[model samples]
Target: VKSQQQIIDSFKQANQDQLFQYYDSLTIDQQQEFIDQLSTIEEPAKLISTVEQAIQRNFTQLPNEQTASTLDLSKDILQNWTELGLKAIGNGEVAVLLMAGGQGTRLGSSAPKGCFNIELPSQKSLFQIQAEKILKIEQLAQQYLKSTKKPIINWYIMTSGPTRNATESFFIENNYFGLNSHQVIFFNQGTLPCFNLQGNKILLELKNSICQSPDGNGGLYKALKDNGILDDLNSKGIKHIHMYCVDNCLVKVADPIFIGFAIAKKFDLATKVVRKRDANESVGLIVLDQDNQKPCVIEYSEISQELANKKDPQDSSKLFLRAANIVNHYYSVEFLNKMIPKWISSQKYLPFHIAKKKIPSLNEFYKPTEPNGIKLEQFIFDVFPSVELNKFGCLEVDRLDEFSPLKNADGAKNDTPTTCRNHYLERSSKWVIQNGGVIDNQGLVEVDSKTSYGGEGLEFVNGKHFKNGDII
Candidate 1:
């Protein structure tokens, strides 16, 4: 908002009593420069208004609820299944970008959320299980590389200020679960200063000031670009990025089906969506962008009552709300480089919840619960509509595979580890049966998800099967 200097002066003058501590917290030049920037942003209301506008523009393609679907899951599976497409995705030069900066606060767990040893008989942590799937896909890609060489699997963990070090240490300490360190790159998302609701000044956390979650996944653009990681990725010939949250085990790692769809459509970007099961679900709606001639995932908050219930003018029999937003997405590296940084660098209006935090109040011995602000965040879908470039493709997947999120200790109905594992197990099991095989007692398929015609693993022909470790 302000040039660097004015912001510093404002913070100094507005928060003079704590100026000594705050000023010292910043270097002399930074102190003077930051407040100068703050001073220029004299009206927090303008900041709030500007941010809301940007957010609205971000997801303008969301369709009305009247058009949302309740399609059978089988139809979804059939549409996305592709033998050739899958092979291409397995061979393409793509990498995964996991946004795992979150703590397990909602789950009431102290350990990293990804490290939770789920009760799934194997006691596998979410991270380990996900790695195994990625490995399976990598192996598939390698096999398909009859002439074209296979690309190494690259995993980029984008963390935040508080969780960056610990996340990296966890992976390193665990030896990256048999993954090579050379293929992994970890970086912190950019943090933005949190302001009061009025948007005038920074939120206080004792003597020093505080900031908020790196301005949402939109920050990933700036984080990678400003940090030179984008350049690094470009050098390595990465053209597409598959992004997913760390908590969902059902997530297909760089799903070849999704990638192939994007490549086929020549999409600048695309996301997977579960057609709406009901009208009550408050998820973002992905639809055709009217102004930009692209696909956009508009947030639920942006839809008005009239728009939500309006029938699709083009197809009255079918409502327009078929696209249900799942967080899984595919992004072209070049498009990401162009738009992400601009959104992150701009001021943001983030949601904050007031909570009662226990802290020392009047005396050192006496502690009391005091009201404090905790930051709420948005997702990458928030920025998908910013470019009016290409097909905003949405492939349908089962709600089971599409909806398992590990956000809370409760929600066992949806977000629990048990639920996530079952989804993964169920889908993989189906793959086994479709190709003619049986699942083991442990919900493990007798054959891996991807195996070859005659040479790889146990073969299932008619009612007979053979194993790699077994003889005639």
Candidate 2:
């Protein structure tokens, strides 16, 4: 530890003298607390270097005459990939990572997002749905492959400082949602001290603690290493990790077909993408990076509307903006272990995205107020360009079957509770109809994964209408 004067001088050098103005007014205990928080702040030099390097980075322009990277998944290809995935599952080589760092603030709930009830009729929580899917997938794979050892896919959840305890307690209270307790693991996303627009550390008035937030999902790599999660996966012989965000209620956790495709193709990283719902959708587009000629995702705001509407010269039928990233990824454990440290240490690996938000902070009068400050975060997809062309793969999945996220509150126009509930009902209706079941115009329908996993085994249902708690 440096001397008190040295720490204070460092703050002054970084133009963060406000942090020291209150230092002399605090009690001895508060002084120690302040120092402890200051110790966690990154060195000013390193932070400046990171920002400078980010400024020099090049962003790709759209309508640049590039080819789509989507892989065709015809009927024969799907069948073959599913078989390959089952073998891996039977051998217990697959694991899952759920990015559950976000709270349900936007959804008007006080709990974590995973604990929100998304089921149409059954009212089952998202956590319960995912856990049941994993259990069902394991059973299906083991039954078909007939491996000697019983298979249990390891489930890893990445939570934030605020949601970690609540998320863990939820799992315990629900008895791990019928999953084995030993197979479930919880880790946290790393937090970085908040820096102002001037690149100075922002301190809260409460005991002079620093204001901090969850480092973006890209921080998942560093968190895994710092928390010994990668070691745990390695010891368990887990080679592949299927990572998905928590908001998508339609996500198929531990999707066997996707896992099998990645393994069969010998890909280091595989991303699941969907055709853009429209040109102005807020999601990112997976495209080739002009700087390195490797696959990368460009955020919606970065590309111009004219470029997005541009058509392919060779094929006028195809638009330049076709594939949209859905944030579902498959990663080889080896690649993550090898590449994460390099990316973290390199200044230019992940660029910081700055956002101005009304953060709850203290005013000059020592009172609480909503102050606008800059919050910097990195996107998890920034690592895509690091993957070689031969090792990278992209698959186009149907949007309706895979991508319905609950982000806004019930009253919002889109991605609201009403929309999610209706989507679930519509999905169940389609599955029931496809399986020769009849339905009167009863408003809501729900399907239980225990009875019919992935819309399978629903052909023998005897009833025309379904309701809450009704089994298929």
Candidate 3:
């Protein structure tokens, strides 16, 4: 047990002696639990200082439309990229990083978001579908590249403190979704202490214990370094890293075409973007910041509505085209390694985004009430503006083909299970039609990666009577 002096000393060092004011009021067990939680706090002074600076600075600079990059998708360019990307995969030089450090609370589900099922008839969860897609990619790469070396793609999933164990166990329960157990690796995203309006750490009472929340996805850079994931990648000789969120069911896991473009263009960093449906789509815009003269993502709320609606003189028919970010990106292993030190050393490297929410807390009478806390989160795209312009690039992909996010519950907003399932159904129908098959009835047909990876090999799907759960 920690000595009384040590406990007091820690509180004093963190300028949290207010905690001591209530310490004596608590029972011995409660006192010990609080101290145990406080023990996890490292560099309290630095953390407090960082929060204070972010509050004082409150950086809110937005990007201009003139700075965004557009892709020229000529036939030759697509073919060239596909060839190179396939070779890279065939050589086992590509790794997929799935950023799934989120819970399903937003979607009204209790489990991890990846565990939520959108399967029409296949009964496959998001994790299962993604796993199958990865497996299919490896198979196709091996088949097309004609390499004697067996094809294997390393899959790294980032989980939060709340979802880590559950996510790991789910994958284990599913037997790694037909993948070699060793091919998939799971790691936890780092967490940061929360603070009150005064910029002091907020202590929560949970079963007579205290708690902290996971830092934003931007924390993945530090988590990778802190957890030795970078070393693991190096050991595996992985050169390219494809990073994406778990919400997109249509995601091409370790997509050869995107990676091919990155490889062919020799860009250290690349992002997949889709044209915003309109000025009011809730997605972040991928723009180039005039101040920084580099690419960056500006959230919808941050950009002015006027700017969003401004029409292009050249094309009045369309809103000045903005590339909506899909949170799917590619990074070379070397670039990721280069970012590690910067991520760990200074909190200022990435700016924090302020969020006000009713954090669960006890009132003056020690009863639960509304949130009374402020959260500081950093975005992964913050790295984009900081990186050199020449090293970064972006591709504008077809929205229906590449972007669909599951971010909310049914009915109230878009990106719910309803929308995700509809996107799947539409895509499945398109695949069936492309394969010259007639969809005479409304029986739900589910096509997974095994059926066709990104709608390839559909020719073999024709002249066959497929049922609800058939694999193409």
Candidate 4:
């Protein structure tokens, strides 16, 4: 692999510290083995030099510098729904690409992210919720005469080596949630050769085989192209893909309005943005690259005082915009096909965190439990580029309706399972009220009650006669 040389180059700098650390601890035989592996690296010096250049190039893009704004959620979404041009596209077949190769390490979950049940009010898991939304959209499409033909929404889940079998098995056992098994596809991403600071592949398990980690989401092009799934998507009349992580509960999976917006604008790829709640929020901030004017995401690490607090020079407004990349995106199939080949020989350079990890070593009985260092990986979203970014659009929704996600388990705020549960309950209640239903004081939807609030729904808190027109 030509990428092999690049990999070796990256590992030269990466494995130096790793080697020194392991050299002092390894046995004579282990030392010799590592040395042999290190010799195979094609160009060690080049890899070290490249990383140093990348380190120097690290910089941040300021917010409001590009003058881009998210879709105004404050506008009358219901009134504009019919005008969105979404129905036409929904009549055309659509596909969903879910990047769920991860297991719930942070949540302490034993299964894949799809298996983690946020358990909404309907007692449905997160995967079930996404499925139901797609079902509802299909059903809704059948009613509109102009777009009466309901489009088929196929789910393409990218699984990793570890989670592939279990992910497919779980879906199969669930009967593919009433969707055709033929429509649901699974594929794997490229794996990384784990390395020590000394530049040798690490043995992850007791097996002599080298330990490998999942390449980052940037591996999507390769995942789709190499697996023949791209051909599958094309054969199904799928011109666009709605991709998002599995953690989001109310992602509006394969949303037609978003799809129509993309088609209407003739974009190659589109993304959803949530207003950044604060300057310090931990979401990717989309901004313009100064040199090329292309769209890029500014990671949290790059957030500096200047960019986070910048104001619009002409408008005299606090450009502390709230838009955050929620990872909800739409991509034209043609664009994706182009992305794959450019990335097939792709090797995104990442430095794994080196820490003290204990493997069981031989005890009093000479039985080894031992300690060792293994390198993990990250996706390539850092360099995800949009050359002609002006063609793309960013849709916005309220922070409450579209934001609460199950990305974490039990933590003070985000990873807390309790918070995720509470967020799910809150959104379910909101959806109920939005679609002509009533929510009682305790966050439960009370269908029996009616309200005077003319918000497409009615609710009577007490034993009072409240209709759509009456005041509070």
Candidate 5:
């Protein structure tokens, strides 16, 4: 490490000397902590360019035109893709990339979102549930290939600064949730400094620590490159990556049908989408960027009222722009390698959207009253516009089966823990009923991830009758 003076000089050169206001008063341990945090803060010049592009929210605009041809979810489609996807997995071409970077503040916990148990019948945390799903997938693939060797999905979980340490220990403490130590890889995404209103200077929340936060999931591109995740995937001989946020209670990890479908269609970027429930629903919708012949998920605020309410003349039940983006995606390693240099290497491709928040300074002891600074973020789905329609595939899946997210408390509108548990149980009950299983009157069934992934391998449950809160 450089001498303390050199670190101080570097901070001064970046025009963020405000962080040093109380530096002399800090203890040795405090000083070291501050220095480490400061090292991650971007230089002043980098901050300006980031904030400049951040104010230019391109994805937040409505396209002049739109088009979406979703491959409908069906038994035949599932049958074909499952076969293809399983073969790919058996060939060691699949990996699971989970974006679990955010903390669980919204869910009433200081832990990572993946650690929340959500009070499921099986008492499984989100991470455990996902791990078991992956285990099931691995088993299914191995069986399909009739291979003695095991098929392992190297799970790459992305964590943020706050959640990084907690997540790692949780995995180890939980025995990697039935996976080998090497099978699960954890990498923390980088952080971007908070910028003042003028975008010319960064803010200091404390004497040593800059007011910065985890770079948005859009930061995945650079994080993957800088952290050697891409190279790691290469060394492991993996190709396709099934990526999704971690908080979805019923997420189909390494979804075979989606993987197979994307592979067969020759798509490098495949995403699963759910139908928009209402004209004014607050969610991103997949739309074609007619200008570039690319696909993008435009924010609900950017949609025009008329376009939002427009319905298909040929089919009244379907809205004209109903393809909702739910953050479940697939990527080929080749595609990531090809696009990384093009997008992040040159500091181009995505814009940093601004979220102004209260940021206290050294004088206030880091307490804030008003929104003093703006946090810059790059969304995960912001990569959609950078992809062409030919290479972009959208699979329209049923919301009840795949789209419950744990993002809020028990009673706040949607996406709460309560909602997630209910959705999980609902899907579990449906899976058994569809597979010839019966439920007792006033009964609810819950399926363990180990039992079935995406309702597959449940034929054995068909002859059984499940009672209230039965976990199969």
Candidate 6:
């Protein structure tokens, strides 16, 4: 204790003394490690002020004009878009940016969410499903070009401190799930310290350590530049990015259609979205930030109750805010390669949205109890203002085909693994049926990513009879 007395005084002055409560019991080596962790954190005084600032901030409603359109995906004319998209892939001009900086805590697992098994016939994890899709995309591109030449689409996975090592090891154990290890890049997202409800104290994971969480998905901007990922991508001739969260079992990774649309339109930013069920269902909307006159997201709770439930006057059945937010996106490398660093240098960054949760570190005696402290997060879509409306677009896709997210345990009502797995199978069954395959009443079917990417190339199964639980 005496050896670390100088550091202890600073903590005491900053009112972060809880961090050293268990210090005297720890071994000298452990104490040293604890002191090192303390050094990694921002000054505790600065941290408290941040929580105060977050508490006082107000969310204003922006004037809204919705801009979204559905793609005529199956039409013959759409072949042109597909052609341009596949060419980009074949030339190594497009890469994937997967946001995997989360753990499976919500799903009742301690490992990375990407490693959470969805109990498919193949028992594939979310990561495997994505990896396989990438492989299939590459194969489809080569076939489209009628050339044997195939180029690897680089995959950049963003991780948080708590899940980084376990994620990398899981990939190693699975051998990168059939992807080249060299092409799959992994990097850490920035983390912010956790704070108490009073906004006066920071939580301690251990008496020797501060509680920290990933600095929200918007943390992606700073992370890309800090990790030199931008430099790697630039040198590799990558001009486009297909970024999506890792938890969607039905996501079309490196989707040719989406990638092709972005290039064809030369969009600065393109988002893939789904139609909202109704105004009452909780979700954010992609709205035009009235004052900024740019596209930005307006969270459901942040808007007025009347506005959230407001129906379109012209089309009474639809809500005024109908463009639902799904975290899938396409970005031009040229745009991000310049904007992020400028934002970082100017100290202008995404604003944090505070959350109330019952975190273990926040527990004086934490439990499955009412929220006792605040966790701050920044939504990924908050960066929409960075791109102009004319250059921005949102592609509306069917929710059943692309939007099931794995966020809860099996026992929960929705967004659980049960729903996620069912969504994948249901979509697969539809793909088979649409191509003239016969499915029994149960509609039990299993189509792996290697067999199809985005429901195309299923002619082999046409007119074939698939029994219940059949893995075609």
Best by lDDT: 5
Q: How much lDDT does candidate 6 score?
A: 0.80
For candidate 6, the 10 contiguous residues with the lowest summed lDDT are: 57-66
Clashes of each: 22, 0, 2, 26, 1, 1
List candidate 3 stretches off by more than 4 Å: 1-8, 25-32, 57-72, 206-208, 364-371, 441-444, 463-471
Write the residue-wise lDDT of candidate 6 on 130-159 in tens digits. Answer: 998898888888888877776689999999
lDDT of each: 0.59, 0.77, 0.77, 0.58, 0.81, 0.80
lDDT of 1 by residue, 1-472 (tens): 5655454444455553333455566676766554553343435445444534443432234533212222433545433533334455455568889887656766777666777764554566777766766676776666665535555668888877677777778888888876777877888876544544334444544333343445566556666776677887688777878888887766677777667667666667777788655554566677766666556665665666556665666777644565667778888877777766665655431222222234332221344355332333445665665655534556666675446666657555655665665665555455454556644445443223234211234335335433321111
Supply candidate 4's per-residue lDDT for 424.
Answer: 52
Model 2 per-residue lDDT tens digits across residues 1-472: 8766777778778766777767788898888877876776668556645654544523343332222222444667777777788778888899999899668987888899999986466778888888988888888888788766568999999999889899999999999988999998999897765655455456563546767888888888878888899899889989998999988888888887888879887889988888777766778888877778788888776677786777766678876667888889999998988888888776466778766556666554343344456566788888888888678888778776777888888887778777777777778777887776766656446777877567767878645655533445
TM-score of 6: 0.91
| Candidate 4 backbone overlaps, count | 26
lDDT of 5 by residue, 203-278 (tens): 7777667778887888998889889999998999998999999988889899888898788788878787787888
lDDT of 4 at 105: 73
Pairs that clash in candidate 2: none
Model 6, residue 318: distance off in Å is: 1.4
lDDT tens per residue, model 4, 44-74: 5553444333334232333332232324433
lDDT of 4 at 247: 79
User: Where's the lowest-lDDT run of ten residues in candidate 4?
Assistant: 446-455
Positional deviation of residue 438's Cα in model 4 after best superposition, in angstroms: 3.7
Models sorted by TM-score, best on top: 6, 2, 3, 5, 4, 1
* Prediction 2 TM-score vs. true: 0.90
